[PDB]
Design a protein around this motif. Structure first.
Motif, short mmCIF file in Angstrom:
data_model
loop_
_atom_site.label_atom_id
_atom_site.label_comp_id
_atom_site.label_asym_id
_atom_site.label_seq_id
_atom_site.Cartn_x
_atom_site.Cartn_y
_atom_site.Cartn_z
N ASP A 248 -6.46 6.58 -5.19
CA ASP A 248 -5.98 5.23 -5.36
C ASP A 248 -5.95 4.83 -6.82
O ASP A 248 -6.02 5.71 -7.66
N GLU B 57 0.77 -1.23 0.00
CA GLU B 57 0.00 0.00 0.00
C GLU B 57 0.80 1.28 0.00
O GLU B 57 0.27 2.31 -0.41
N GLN C 40 -7.99 -5.16 0.93
CA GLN C 40 -8.03 -4.48 -0.36
C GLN C 40 -9.40 -4.52 -1.02
O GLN C 40 -9.82 -3.58 -1.62
N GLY D 238 -3.32 2.83 2.65
CA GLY D 238 -4.46 2.27 1.96
C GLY D 238 -5.78 2.58 2.68
O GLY D 238 -6.77 1.87 2.54
N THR E 194 -7.98 8.52 -0.83
CA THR E 194 -7.35 7.70 0.20
C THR E 194 -6.29 8.48 0.94
O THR E 194 -5.91 9.55 0.54
#
Ligand SMILES: [Cl-]
Ligand SMILES: [Cl-]
Length: 162
Positions: free
Chosen positions: A20, A11, A105, A30, A26
């Motif tokens: 992102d 990340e 994720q 992450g 973001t």
């Protein structure tokens, strides 16, 4: 090597709001803030999360604290998930790290949809599940990260990460 170092590699760390790979707002490690296109909305979500008027910038400590909360939320979702729990329980410690990654994720719902690969994972059909995990939008959009995660599911070592 552990889940934290692993995700930190995948990340990266950013102290200002950013977008992102999907174009979402973001920040930190992450931590997705909103699917909304408005930077104002993003700013508002970040201030809520930190508990302060951030001005769209956080500190290292702050990023790490979100990260901790997020890894914990991730594990908890897997254990609460009827489709996930079982897979998780059946796997070794490294492979467990790879399932947590995928969840972090793609969200639990997201991972919970990979019905066929979950089944192969549970059956311990490593090569088979790796191929199957490969036929996905996930692998096509973020090929290098997916390659690393999949390699981890396949082998049960951290080789893709060292
Ligand atoms: Cl939060
Ligand atoms: Cl990638």
């Amino acid at each position: 090597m552990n889940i934290f170092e692993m995700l930190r590699i995948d990340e990266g760390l950013r102290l200002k709001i950013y977008k992102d790979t999907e174009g979402y707002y973001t920040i930190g490690i992450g931590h997705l803030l909103t699917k909304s296109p408005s930077l104002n909305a993003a700013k508002s979500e970040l201030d809520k999360a930190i508990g302060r008027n951030t001005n769209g910038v956080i500190t290292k400590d702050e990023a790490e604290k979100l990260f901790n909360q997020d890894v914990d939320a991730a594990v908890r979702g897997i254990l609460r998930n009827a489709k996930l729990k079982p897979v998780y329980d059946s796997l070794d410690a490294v492979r467990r790290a790879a399932l947590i990654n995928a969840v972090f994720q793609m969200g639990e719902t997201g991972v919970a949809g990979f019905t066929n690969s979950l089944r192969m994972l549970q059956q311990k059909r490593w090569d088979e599940a790796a191929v199957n995990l490969a036929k996905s939008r996930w692998y096509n959009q973020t090929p290098n990260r997916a390659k690393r995660v999949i390699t981890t599911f396949r082998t049960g070592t951290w080789d893709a990460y060292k």
